[PDB]
């Protein structure tokens, strides 16, 4: 499936064409990047802040045009957040979860919010 970039960086293939959402995704990629390089509390903290913030803003933009698939996308966001709140050290899974998230879940909203 979806190739996990390496180095774990955001590439134009992730584009939603929503400049704001795009730039936040870039910062999130950077978050996990360091996470895999040192699973520590500070990196997790930085990523955890960045994630939840971005996850809320995207839900905000979705709710603003009453996005049809808001709930499923919100359930999704809750999942990765729960994961981050009960970390087991699985960086690979986060890497693949995050990529598959933008490409199959975020992508559903392109042209709709």
């Amino acid at each position: 499936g979806f190739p996990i970039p390496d180095p774990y960086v955001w590439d134009p293939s992730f584009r939603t064409f929503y400049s704001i959402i795009d730039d936040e995704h870039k910062t999130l990629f950077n978050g996990i990047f360091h996470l895999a390089i040192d699973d520590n509390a500070d990196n997790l903290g930085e990523l955890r802040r960045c994630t939840g913030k971005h996850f809320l803003n995207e839900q905000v933009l979705m709710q603003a045009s009453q996005y049809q698939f808001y709930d499923e996308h919100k359930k999704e966001h809750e999942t990765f957040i729960h994961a981050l709140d009960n970390w087991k050290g699985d960086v690979k899974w986060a890497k693949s979860w995050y990529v598959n998230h933008i490409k199959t879940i975020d992508f559903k909203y392109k042209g709709k919010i």
Copy 2:
């Protein structure tokens, strides 16, 4: 009943006298214009975006002034959005639904928000 403009474009007879609201209505007539020329998913998505944003935006405006008949107006919106989330291709009903909504349901909030 209310005449359906052909071409399905917005005209001054639809004015609510709230500029921002009148402008969003012009864009909404446009979404249904194309949705009748080619019932595709991009045109439905473009309409579903504009509609839902407008519906919410117009509801935010009603709540700012604690609009008295906000509930029936919200019921009106949920139906057309519902229709759009269960689309059958009856662009005629969509065309006549919006015209009446503006002139009968949107018109009520005139001077009241």
Copy 3:
């Protein structure tokens, strides 16, 4: 009791010392003013707009500083709004209630929001 200013205009004895709230009280006085001269549907509407609009803005600021007496003040607001939405031309009562509302319920939030 509280003197019902005649003409029914806002005056300095009604200062909450909140400039934006004060400017909105002036506008609302003018609503009751015309409503007393012509009890029609538009005058009632104009008032019902500024009133509901004013009450909300005031509830927002009260909440911003977690105003201790917020519930009581909201039951008040609603009472007037219910009254406006159930008009019976009682302009004198509307004049007095508003006079007492600023002077007793509004004056409580002074220096607290």
Copy 4:
């Protein structure tokens, strides 16, 4: 050549059809009303704050839609603001100036901002 209201209160003939502008004009009328009754520095100060505010807000409305006649309108606003800053007590002039400004100068922007 417009009639000076008595009492100097705002009435519907003054509507520009822009609710927030109409609300600001209602307050502005109140400030000259008290200044007329008592020309004190406090009543002036109040009117001056309200006039400096409304003139700016309104000017911002005009610059938003790149109003065609902004400069003439601004020159006007600076004229009353100037009269207020070199107040000579001519409360009769002030009343007709403001009554005319909205009825000739403000009315000109109706449907353009």
Copy 5:
């Protein structure tokens, strides 16, 4: 060098892929659409406002990312505003200028703001 739609109405070929900018164009199109049918002062001012408002909104959009060609873009806006301010009644030129502005000048900012 681009074909003038008939009826003069916005279409997806006109996409800049920026939702708000795209929605505003649909409103501006409606504006010239009516100015073509009836060249009166009402229709012209409606167009002028929506034109003045959109050109500014877009210019701020370009300024927020320090667009490289904001200057040449600005001047072009001023050309059509000047035309509107000094209207000779050339509804033909108006229709092509705008269709061509969006596709040759707006398009330049695609992915840059």
Copy 6:
């Protein structure tokens, strides 16, 4: 344990590194500082005000990033508001509570909001 500064003035050792949050922390120190010198209604009011504002402002900063320990932090806040709303003149506890709140409860959100 934690040293209650004398005079009760916010010092750099209370830094959360969120400038806006620290400035509000400087003003909350001021309120307590006065309430200590004179337990009166007007000093209590002042404190109750900045306090509730800061508590909400900080809760809105926490919820932005979907903070993990938002609840315990809300409970904490509610406790101190209750104290203020059921004032027993215990200015010592307040001085100790607040110093301890920042350093053990606010300090938790550093890098996380």
Copy 7:
């Protein structure tokens, strides 16, 4: 001529009755409070940052109502910033200048912004 607090903390005698502005004044008093204790670079930057933020924030408030004495006030503001930018260690002169700034110059904008 105004009395310099000791400790150099803000007190209700300072209130301009603009809650937001008053709160900023508190933080500002704290900045210079510590500069008096330790003239170090950090204490000066913290202060300097606070003076720049408030001074600009307050000038935005004055411009919002076109304050009559904005130019003079801005010149006062520049005098302090300049002394902070060309610091000679005169912490005594800084304490009076600021107490005297709010008590004589800021106080002039009371009921005017």
Copy 8:
């Protein structure tokens, strides 16, 4: 004098301790990272947009607290933007220019904006 990351990614050592600013630096690094790999027109624009946005946001933050060294910092920003407006493909210069820009010029505004 600072080492260039490899891969060219933002790392904790580049912290300004301003979350959003650091969140913006993280994305900028990514913009030049790809441009190094493939110097195409598209990558240049993604970087050029982000560089424009960030530079403005930051200059606005510096303007907010009236940063003493704002002027000097604005010229530095103009250097990179100018270079990006007259791109000759010198990716190595850009890698080091940015790395040094934040570590020496940005770092100067720490605790001052």
